[PDB]
Amino acid sequence: NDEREYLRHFWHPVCTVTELEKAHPSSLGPLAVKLLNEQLVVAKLGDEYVAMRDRCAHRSAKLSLGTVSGNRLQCPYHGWQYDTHGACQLVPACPNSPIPNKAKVDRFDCEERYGLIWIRLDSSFDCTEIPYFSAANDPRLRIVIQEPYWWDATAERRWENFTDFSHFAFIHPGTLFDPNNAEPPIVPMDRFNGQFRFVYDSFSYTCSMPFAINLEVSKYSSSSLHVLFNVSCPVDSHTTKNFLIFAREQSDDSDYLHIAFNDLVFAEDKPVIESQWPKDAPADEVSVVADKVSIQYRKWLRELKEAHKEGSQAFRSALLDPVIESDRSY
Amino acid sequence: NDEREYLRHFWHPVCTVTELEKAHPSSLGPLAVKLLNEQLVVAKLGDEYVAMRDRCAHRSAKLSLGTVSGNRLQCPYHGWQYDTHGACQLVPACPNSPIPNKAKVDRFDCEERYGLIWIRLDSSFDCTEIPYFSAANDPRLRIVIQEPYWWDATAERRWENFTDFSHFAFIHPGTLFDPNNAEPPIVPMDRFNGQFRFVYDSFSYTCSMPFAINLEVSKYSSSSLHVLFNVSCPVDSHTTKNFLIFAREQSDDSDYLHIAFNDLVFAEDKPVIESQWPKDAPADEVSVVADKVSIQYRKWLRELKEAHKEGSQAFRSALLDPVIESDRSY
Amino acid sequence: NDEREYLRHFWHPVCTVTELEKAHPSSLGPLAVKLLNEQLVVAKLGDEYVAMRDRCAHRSAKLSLGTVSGNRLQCPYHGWQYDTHGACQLVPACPNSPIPNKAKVDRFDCEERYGLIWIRLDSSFDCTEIPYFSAANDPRLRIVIQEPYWWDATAERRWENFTDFSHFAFIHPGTLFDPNNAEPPIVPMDRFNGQFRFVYDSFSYTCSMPFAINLEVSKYSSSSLHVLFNVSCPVDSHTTKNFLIFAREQSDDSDYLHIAFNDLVFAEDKPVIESQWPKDAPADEVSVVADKVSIQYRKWLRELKEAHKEGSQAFRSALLDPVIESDRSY
Amino acid sequence: NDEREYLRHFWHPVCTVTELEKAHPSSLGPLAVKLLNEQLVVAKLGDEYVAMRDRCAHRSAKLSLGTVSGNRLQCPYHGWQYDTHGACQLVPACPNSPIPNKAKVDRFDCEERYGLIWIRLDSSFDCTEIPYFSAANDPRLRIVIQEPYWWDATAERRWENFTDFSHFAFIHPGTLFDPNNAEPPIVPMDRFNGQFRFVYDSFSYTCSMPFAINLEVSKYSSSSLHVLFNVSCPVDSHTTKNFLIFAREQSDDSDYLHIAFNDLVFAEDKPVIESQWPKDAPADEVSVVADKVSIQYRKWLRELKEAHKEGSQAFRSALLDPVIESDRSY
Amino acid sequence: NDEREYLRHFWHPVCTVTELEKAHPSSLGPLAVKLLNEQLVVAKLGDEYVAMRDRCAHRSAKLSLGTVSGNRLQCPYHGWQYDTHGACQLVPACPNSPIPNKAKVDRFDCEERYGLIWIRLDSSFDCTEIPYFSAANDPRLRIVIQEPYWWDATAERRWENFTDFSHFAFIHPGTLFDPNNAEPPIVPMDRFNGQFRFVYDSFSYTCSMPFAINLEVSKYSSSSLHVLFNVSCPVDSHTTKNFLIFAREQSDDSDYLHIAFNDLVFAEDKPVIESQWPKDAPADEVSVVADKVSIQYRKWLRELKEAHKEGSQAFRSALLDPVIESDRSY
Amino acid sequence: NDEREYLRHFWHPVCTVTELEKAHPSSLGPLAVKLLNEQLVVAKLGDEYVAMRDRCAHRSAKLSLGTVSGNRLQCPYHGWQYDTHGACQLVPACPNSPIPNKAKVDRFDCEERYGLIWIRLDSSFDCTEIPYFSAANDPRLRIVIQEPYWWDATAERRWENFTDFSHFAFIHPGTLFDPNNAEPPIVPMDRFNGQFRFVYDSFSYTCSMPFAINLEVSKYSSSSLHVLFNVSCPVDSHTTKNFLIFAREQSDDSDYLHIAFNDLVFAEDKPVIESQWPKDAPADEVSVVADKVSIQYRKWLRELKEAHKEGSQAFRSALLDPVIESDRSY
Ligand code: FES
Ligand code: FES
Ligand code: FES
Ligand code: FES
Ligand code: FES
Ligand code: FES
Ligand SMILES: [Fe+3]
Ligand SMILES: [Fe+3]
Ligand SMILES: [Fe+3]
Ligand SMILES: [Fe+3]
Ligand SMILES: [Fe+3]
Ligand SMILES: [Fe+3]
C-alpha cells in the first residue's frame, strides 16, 4: 500500500550476521525476513549474501524452509534450485527437460556491512547508499552488536524518539536526565549527502535518511568517545525490528555494563512509544519550538515522498542536495 | 460506523470508583477506558472526575500511562499537563514560551454516581440523565458493588437477556425456574421519563434507556426488599463491560452469599449469549408473543435512532414523551 | 466470495461418527461443524443424522450448545424444538399460540457413510454423490478410521500434495523415497463417473472429485493389499479438516504401526504445504512436465467452476461425462 | 517397606495392550511401567509379552528408551540385547568376547489377558492367577476397554470406594442414588477360590483379591445384562493407575454413552477419595454396621499379609480356602 | 516436630472473615486451613465459628470438601454430621443404630476478632489471649483489612523484619528511609501483660507475643494517627500467611492509596526475608547494638520455650510477669 | 554426605565470565552459584574474582541479592560490606562502634581462567590445580565459549559419557558413527601430573581429574586441528552445570556451524544419560573389556577417595604419582 513506496529505494537492515548463521544448522541460512511487508529469504550462496522473495515459482512453497545446496537455494518441496540471480538451474523431476523461462523468483540487492545484512528492494534510482556508521574501521574502538529489539511502533516514530531531547526528564529521570542542563536547545541542522547533521553541548548526530542515527558522544574530548548507531527496520506498517551497534574507546570495562544500560533506557521508552496512536503521525499534532528536529525530519520525508513521485532525478536531488544552516564548512 | 452514533448522547458507565482508585498507586488514576470504540482516560483532578481522550495533543502518547500532578493530568512522554478543561497549562520544554492554542484534548461530561463513573460523549442534545438506581439514599438497604464482568456480547443483547422471562426454564433450571410458573406473562409496558416500566407477579422493572435495568423485588419469601441494578457499557462492536450493584433489606447475611449466586446466574447465561450471532440482532429474527419486552425495546431503540437523525428536539421527544399502557399514574 | 460457490454441490465430510458421539454425553450430539465458511450443527434425530444452520431462528443462539430431546434438537436459550426438516414444532413460552412460518432453520442433506458424516449444502443439481471408498464391503479387509488432522492449507493444495510424486525425495527421504524408482512417471489420466483414475507401476488411484482420493497399493512384496482413503473438508478459506481411513488385508499387526507411519508422513508434508502462499494457487505458478496430475486437476476444477454458472445440466456434463485417455475397460 | 511385600505375589495390570502398541512407532514397545514402586519395561518379543526391570545391567540406562530388535530388547546406550529370559545375548563392543554371567536383568511373569498386560513380580508361591472377568467368551456381549484413569489414592481405598453403598446419596446424588433403595443392606459375603462374592437385590459382585472387582448388573428394566470390571494398579505408595473394562448385551447404542457416564461417576468420587488422609487406612477409623464390606476386605488383607510371612502354603491357604456365609452352591 | 510445641498455646489467625465467606457458595464455609502443620477446617455452625481437624473419623475424608447442614458440618463422602463439639450426631446409613462413641473429630478453640478468625490449638494452660489491636472500637478511625499475603519465611523472621530499624536505608530507600534521621536508636523495652512495648521519635509498638505487632504512628499528635496491625500465621516450618489490618483517622483519602503503599513496602522486603537461610535463626548469627529488639525478642521466646517444658504455672509467669525497663508507669 | 568430601579439594568451574558480568547491571556481579550443595556468591571486588558463602553473618540474607560497592560486597538487608577476605568492614547502623570479630563469612580460593570462574572449597591439601586446556594461548586457534548446559546427571556419569567409545553406533548413529570403525579399541591409559592421557586412531585425551576432559583432534578431513574442552561442575547430588569451550584451526567458518553440531550431540546423549539410575553408579554394574576407560576412572576416583581419608600427603600422592602404560615420555 503505496504511501510507503519511496521507502523501497533505501537500504534497510533485516537481520544481524549472527542471526543468519544461527537460523539453520548449516550456518548458511536460509533465514526468513520481512521488510516493508515483503516476505523475503536471505541465504549465503557462495561468497554472496543473496536475498530473494520467500516464495518459490513452482508451487509457491517458502524457500526459507529449504536448504542451501552448494551455491544455490533448494526449495524444500520438490527440490528446485535457485542461483544468485534467482533463476532455476535444476528441476530434479525432469533433469533432462528444458527449464521454463518463468522458473524464476525475484532477487534483491543484498549486502553485508557493520555486522548486519542490508536489502534494497528497488535499485532503479541508483542513488542510495547503506547508512553511515562513524566507528567502523577506527581501530581505537571496541564495537558491540546488540541483539535486535522489536517495538510495536513505526520506524519514523522510533527515529524521532531516539533524537528527542524534551523527554529525558520524564521517561529517563534515573538514567539520562541531566538536571542542571534540564532544558533542550534549538540547534542548526544541515542536510549533507543524504544525512541530517546537528550537535549539542558534546553530542554529534549523523542521521542517514530515513531511519539511521549515528551518535558520537565525546566527553569534551578530554576523556574518550562513545558511538551509538541505531537503525530501524520498517517490518510492516505497525512494527520495527531495531538494531543498535555501539562502539567505545574505553574497552577495559564489561560489554554487559553498557548492554544493560542501553537495554534499560530502551525499556523505559518502549511502552510510551508503542502507545502513540495513530501509529503514523497525523496532521493534527501540535508542536512547540523544542520540536525543531522532529518537524525538520518530517519536512524532508515529505519532500522525499513527493520527489519520488516526480521520478529518479527529482529524488536524487531531494536526497543529496545540501541544505546548510550552520557555520560548519563542507 | 455511525449507526451507533445516537448512543453517544447517553450517560454510560466506564468503571467502578474502586477500579479508578486501584489503577495507579496515587489512587488518583489515570485509568484507561474504552466507550463505544473511543479511547479515553479518566482521572481525579482536584474535586472532579475528569474524562479526556486518551491521546496527547503533542505527539499522541496515551495519557493513561501518565500521572496526576496537582489538579492536572501529566503526559508520560514530555510532561504536558492538562487541566479539568483538557487545555494544556504547562509545556516543560519551553516554560518561557506561550502554549499553542491547539494544545488541548477533547474533554467529556464525566460524573460519579452510585459508585460508578459515567461519561457522556455527546452533550449537544442536553436531554439525557444518568440511569435511575432505586436503592441509592434509602438508608434501610445495604448496597454492594460487584466487580465489572465482561461478556463477548453487545449491550443490546445483554439487556434483552436480563429482562427476558422465557429462558428461566432452560438456562437457569436449578437456580431461577419456578415449576408451576413455567410460562411467561405478557405485561403492560409504559414509557416514562425516558424509562421502560413494567411489573410481574413481585418484580418491578425500571429500565433507563438504553442499557440500564433497575429491578426491585418484594420477595415471596420475606416481605422485605432486594434490588438489582445492572447496566451494560458498550465498549466496542462485540463486547460489553457489565456492572451489577445490588441492595438488600435483610442485610444480616454475608455479602458473598448473594455475590456467589449472581455470579452463578451470569455464568449460566454467558456462554449462550456470547454464542448469539451476528452480534447485533438482524431483521430476520422471528419473535413470538412472549417476547413482548424484546420487541418494545427494539422498537424504542429504532425510533430513538431515527429521532437522532432528525435532530435535537425530535430525539428529546422520542426519549421523554410518555406512553402509558398499564393503569398507573406517575 | 462467489468464487467458491460451486463447491456447495458436493458432499463434504465434516466429522467422524465417533466425533458426533463423543461431543455430548448423550452420544446423540449436537456437534458444531464448519463447512465452506458455514457454521452448522449435526445431531442424531431418531434414525437420521440431520444438519442445520447452527443459528436458531428465534434469537440467533447456537443450537450446538443445545440438547437432543427425543427426535428433535432443542435450542439452549428459550427451548424451541426443531425436527428433521428444520421446522420448529414447540415454543415453550406460548405452547398453544401458532408457531410462526419463519420458525424454521435451513436443513442440509446429511448422510453417514464409511464412519463419516457427510453434508451437501446445495442439492438443486442432484448429480453428486459421496466419494467412493474401494474397501467398504471387502471382508478380506480391516478398516481403521484415523482421527481428523487439521492443516492450515486449502483442500486443493492438500489434494495436490496427496497425489504428488516429485516431492518424495525432499520431504520424505527416509519414509517414501525409492532411489530405484527415483524419477516420476507421466501416466494417462481418465475422467470416469466424476472421478480421476490413474495407475502406477502397482498404485491405482480413484479420485472422486473434488477433494477425495482412493489409492490402492498392490505392494511388490506379496499378495497383501493396502488402501488409503483421504479426503479434505474445506472448512474455510485457509484451513482444512482432513480425514484418513485406511484398510489392509495383512491384518495380524497393530493398527498403531500404520497410524504412526501415516502420521509421520503427514508431519513431514504439513509445514511445507502450510507454508505455500497465497493459500489458493495463483496464475503465475510455473509448472514442468512432471506436474501433469496437478495441471489436469486444476483444469478440471476450472471446467467445474464455469459449468456451475451455466446451470444444472452443464455442470452434470462437466462432472460426469467420461473422458478416457488410457486403454482400459469401464 | 516390607509392609507391602505380600502384594508382589499377585498379578497386577500395568497397561492396556493398546498403550503398549501406541508407546513406540514399531507398536512392539518398549513401554515404561511402574508397579509397587518397581520401574519396569514391557516389550513384545516374538509372541511373548515380556517384562524386565527398566534398568540395564551395563551402565544402568533405561531400556524403555531403547528399541525392539527382532526378538530382543536393545538398550539405547551401548546396544546390549536382552532376550525373553532377561539374558544379554549380544554386546556390540566385543561381539566375540564371552558375555558376563551378570549380564542379565530381572525378568517377571508377564502375560496378556482381556486386553491388559499383567505382571507378577514374585512367582515363588505359584498360587495366584489373573483376576476373573465374567464377560470374556460371552458372544452376547460387547466389551469396551476404557483408557486408564489415574487417581492420587491407594488401591485399597480405590477398592473400598468401588464396593461402597453408603456414599451414593452424597457424592452421586444425580447419577447413582435411588431414593427408594435409599438405605444400604448388609449381605452375606463368601470367600471362594480367592475371591469375595456377594449379591444385591440384582447386583452380583465377584472380587478377585486384592484390587479387582467384577460386578454383574441384571437391571430392573428388561433382560439386558451389564458387567463392569475395575482393577487398580498400585503404582506406588500414593497413586493408582486404574482400568475399567465394561461389557453390555444391549449393544445397539454408542460406546461413548457409557464412557461419559462412567467418567462422570469417577469424576465425582475422585476429589473425595483423593482427599482421604493418611493415604493408607489407619487403626483409628470408626466404622459402623454398614461398613461390612470394608471391614471384611480389610480383615482378609490382614490375614493375607500375615500368611505371607509364614510362607508359601500358609498364604495359599489364607487366599484360596473357601469360607462361605450364604446359601449358594459352589 | 516438637521444638514448636509451645506455639500451640497461643492464638493464631488462620483466615479473614471474608475468606471464610468466599470459600463456599453457602457463605458458611467450610474452609480448609493449616496452622503449625495441623490440617484444620473452619465453618460457621449456627452463631459459632467452629474449628475441627480436617479429617473425618469414619473413613478419613476431608470435611473441608463437605458442606454445612443446619448447625453441623457434613462430611462429603458418607454424609456424617458433626456438631460444634466435633461429635457425630447423624450416620445416614444406620440412622437407627447407636452412634459409636469414637465417632468424633478433634475440635479447637475458634473465635473471631478484628475481622479475622483465631484458633488456639492447646487450651490447657488457660493463660493466652488473642493479640491486642489498639484501634478496634475507636470510632474516629477507619479500619481496612488487606488480603492475606504469603511469604516463604517463618513467623519469627517476619516478626523481626517488621520491627527492624536498620534496614530502611537499603530495602526501602524510596519509601521509608528518612535520610536526616538515618541511624536507629536504642530504646528501652518493657514486658507487660504478654506484650513487648517500645517507642521512637513518634512510633509506639505493642507486640503481643509471639507474632503480632500493633504499631501506632502519630505525627507528634499535631496531625493525626495511623495504626498498623500485622500478625503472622505460622502455617508450617517454612511458611507464613501474613495479615495486615490498618486504621487511620484521616479517612477522606482512598483506601487503595495506603493499600498500594503497604503492598509496595512488603514487596521490597519479601525477596530478602525469603532468602535468609537457614529459615530458623541459628546460633551463629552475629549481632551489633542496633539489634536490641531482635535479641530481646529471641531471649523471651527461648524463655517461653523453657517455661513451657516446666509446665503451666511456669509458662503463665514467663508470659505475664512484667519486666519494665523504661520510666513509663503501669 | 561426606562420601563426596574429597571432591572439595579440586578446582571446579561455577560459571562463565559473561554469566557473572550479565548477572547484575553493574557487570561486577554478584552471582549466586551452587557447588557440591554449597551456596556461594561470586563477585568482582577490585581486581579479584571473589567467592564467599552466599549467607550474611548478621541475619543470614543471601549476599547474591546485594550489590558491589567499591571493592566490597554489600548485603541487601542492612548493608554490611565484605572485603576480599570475607571480613565485614562497615556496619552502617553503628558506624561509630567496633565491628564484631565474628562478623565475617567464609571466603574461598577463586580464580579466573579460560573464561570460566573456578572455586576450590578446601585448600588444605594444597596440591590441586585448575584443569588443563591445551588451546589457551595458542594464537593459531579460535576459541569459543558455549553457554553452560545443564543435565539431570552427575559429573562422574557426564565424564564417562564423553570419553565413552561404545555409544557412537547407537546414540549418535547419524552424527559420529564411523561404519567401518564400529568396534572400540582398548587403549593404553597413563596417569601423568594428575591427568589421564590416552589416544585413539587421531584423538588425544588429556583429562585433568576428576571432571575435566581436553580432547585434541588432528582431523582425518583437514591436516588441521580442533579442540574440545569439557568440564562438569557437580552442583548437587543429581545435577551438573556443564561447560564446553572449543578451539579450531580452520577459523574461517561460522562459530554457529560447530555450536549447532555440539548442541545436537549433547541433545542425543542427554535423555539417555539422565535416564541412568541410580544417579551414582552402584557396584552391581557389569563392565566389559571395552569399558577400559570407565574402569580405570572409577578405580582412580575410588583410590583418591580413600587417599583423602588417610590425609594430605597420601592424597597428593594418589593424584600426582605417575603411572605409565603406553610408550610415551612426558
Ligand atoms: S514448490 Fe518449490 S519445488 Fe515445488
Ligand atoms: S507527547 Fe505528550 S507531552 Fe509530548
Ligand atoms: S433463541 Fe433459540 S429458543 Fe430463543
Ligand atoms: S548401558 Fe545399556 S548397553 Fe551400556
Ligand atoms: S468419611 Fe466422613 S462419612 Fe465416611
Ligand atoms: S543480614 Fe546482612 S546486613 Fe543484616
Ligand atoms: Fe529515549
Ligand atoms: Fe439470566
Ligand atoms: Fe506427502
Ligand atoms: Fe463411587
Ligand atoms: Fe520491612
Ligand atoms: Fe556423546
mmCIF file of C-alpha atoms in Angstrom, chain B residues 35-123:
data_model
loop_
_atom_site.group_PDB
_atom_site.id
_atom_site.type_symbol
_atom_site.label_atom_id
_atom_site.label_comp_id
_atom_site.label_asym_id
_atom_site.label_seq_id
_atom_site.Cartn_x
_atom_site.Cartn_y
_atom_site.Cartn_z
ATOM 1 C CA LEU B 35 -16.527 3.504 25.413
ATOM 2 C CA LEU B 36 -18.148 2.875 22.008
ATOM 3 C CA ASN B 37 -14.755 2.283 20.391
ATOM 4 C CA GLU B 38 -13.463 5.566 21.879
ATOM 5 C CA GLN B 39 -10.187 5.502 23.796
ATOM 6 C CA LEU B 40 -10.474 7.625 26.907
ATOM 7 C CA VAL B 41 -8.584 8.320 30.123
ATOM 8 C CA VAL B 42 -10.284 9.035 33.495
ATOM 9 C CA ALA B 43 -8.631 10.830 36.420
ATOM 10 C CA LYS B 44 -9.445 12.689 39.653
ATOM 11 C CA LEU B 45 -8.282 16.285 39.167
ATOM 12 C CA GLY B 46 -8.943 18.196 42.373
ATOM 13 C CA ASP B 47 -12.609 17.597 43.209
ATOM 14 C CA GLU B 48 -13.616 16.369 39.764
ATOM 15 C CA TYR B 49 -13.655 13.046 37.963
ATOM 16 C CA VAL B 50 -12.314 14.171 34.565
ATOM 17 C CA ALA B 51 -12.569 12.274 31.272
ATOM 18 C CA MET B 52 -10.376 13.120 28.254
ATOM 19 C CA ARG B 53 -9.478 11.397 25.019
ATOM 20 C CA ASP B 54 -6.502 9.137 25.898
ATOM 21 C CA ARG B 55 -4.292 10.848 23.319
ATOM 22 C CA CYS B 56 -1.873 13.710 23.981
ATOM 23 C CA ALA B 57 -2.065 16.720 21.677
ATOM 24 C CA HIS B 58 1.743 16.932 21.294
ATOM 25 C CA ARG B 59 2.870 13.596 19.890
ATOM 26 C CA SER B 60 -0.116 11.324 20.694
ATOM 27 C CA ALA B 61 1.060 9.251 23.680
ATOM 28 C CA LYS B 62 -1.639 7.686 25.813
ATOM 29 C CA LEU B 63 -2.214 9.938 28.800
ATOM 30 C CA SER B 64 -3.314 6.829 30.719
ATOM 31 C CA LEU B 65 0.404 5.987 31.045
ATOM 32 C CA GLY B 66 0.897 9.435 32.635
ATOM 33 C CA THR B 67 0.491 10.646 36.203
ATOM 34 C CA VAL B 68 -1.776 13.086 38.037
ATOM 35 C CA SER B 69 0.222 16.128 39.199
ATOM 36 C CA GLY B 70 -1.682 18.764 41.144
ATOM 37 C CA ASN B 71 -5.073 19.268 39.523
ATOM 38 C CA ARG B 72 -3.767 18.282 36.090
ATOM 39 C CA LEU B 73 -3.034 15.103 34.184
ATOM 40 C CA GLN B 74 0.605 14.970 33.103
ATOM 41 C CA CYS B 75 1.572 13.176 29.888
ATOM 42 C CA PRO B 76 4.164 10.379 30.189
ATOM 43 C CA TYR B 77 6.255 11.482 27.209
ATOM 44 C CA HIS B 78 7.201 15.177 27.571
ATOM 45 C CA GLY B 79 5.034 16.038 30.577
ATOM 46 C CA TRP B 80 2.497 18.437 29.146
ATOM 47 C CA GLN B 81 -0.155 18.967 31.811
ATOM 48 C CA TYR B 82 -3.902 19.189 31.128
ATOM 49 C CA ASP B 83 -6.451 20.908 33.387
ATOM 50 C CA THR B 84 -10.103 19.952 34.006
ATOM 51 C CA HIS B 85 -10.954 21.507 30.600
ATOM 52 C CA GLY B 86 -8.443 19.447 28.633
ATOM 53 C CA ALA B 87 -6.284 22.500 27.993
ATOM 54 C CA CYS B 88 -2.534 22.236 28.310
ATOM 55 C CA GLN B 89 -1.305 24.530 31.075
ATOM 56 C CA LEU B 90 2.426 23.679 31.057
ATOM 57 C CA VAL B 91 4.939 22.766 28.345
ATOM 58 C CA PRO B 92 8.062 21.763 30.329
ATOM 59 C CA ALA B 93 10.411 22.200 27.351
ATOM 60 C CA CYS B 94 9.650 25.905 26.707
ATOM 61 C CA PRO B 95 8.314 27.227 30.003
ATOM 62 C CA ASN B 96 9.034 30.778 28.815
ATOM 63 C CA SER B 97 7.089 30.333 25.576
ATOM 64 C CA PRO B 98 3.347 30.689 25.026
ATOM 65 C CA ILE B 99 1.313 27.497 24.825
ATOM 66 C CA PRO B 100 -0.242 26.858 21.391
ATOM 67 C CA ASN B 101 -3.955 27.356 21.302
ATOM 68 C CA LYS B 102 -4.474 23.961 19.647
ATOM 69 C CA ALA B 103 -2.557 22.406 22.595
ATOM 70 C CA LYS B 104 -5.705 20.806 24.016
ATOM 71 C CA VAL B 105 -7.517 17.482 24.077
ATOM 72 C CA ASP B 106 -11.207 16.663 23.960
ATOM 73 C CA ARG B 107 -12.860 16.609 27.365
ATOM 74 C CA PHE B 108 -16.150 14.908 28.201
ATOM 75 C CA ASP B 109 -19.045 15.134 30.608
ATOM 76 C CA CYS B 110 -17.933 12.925 33.463
ATOM 77 C CA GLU B 111 -19.779 12.439 36.742
ATOM 78 C CA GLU B 112 -19.652 9.949 39.589
ATOM 79 C CA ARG B 113 -22.831 8.321 40.870
ATOM 80 C CA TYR B 114 -23.696 5.102 42.746
ATOM 81 C CA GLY B 115 -20.001 4.212 42.909
ATOM 82 C CA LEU B 116 -19.545 4.207 39.134
ATOM 83 C CA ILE B 117 -18.012 6.776 36.788
ATOM 84 C CA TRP B 118 -20.266 7.898 33.921
ATOM 85 C CA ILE B 119 -19.260 9.549 30.649
ATOM 86 C CA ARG B 120 -21.448 11.335 28.074
ATOM 87 C CA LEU B 121 -19.597 11.606 24.758
ATOM 88 C CA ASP B 122 -22.070 13.996 23.099
ATOM 89 C CA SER B 123 -23.777 16.679 25.185
#
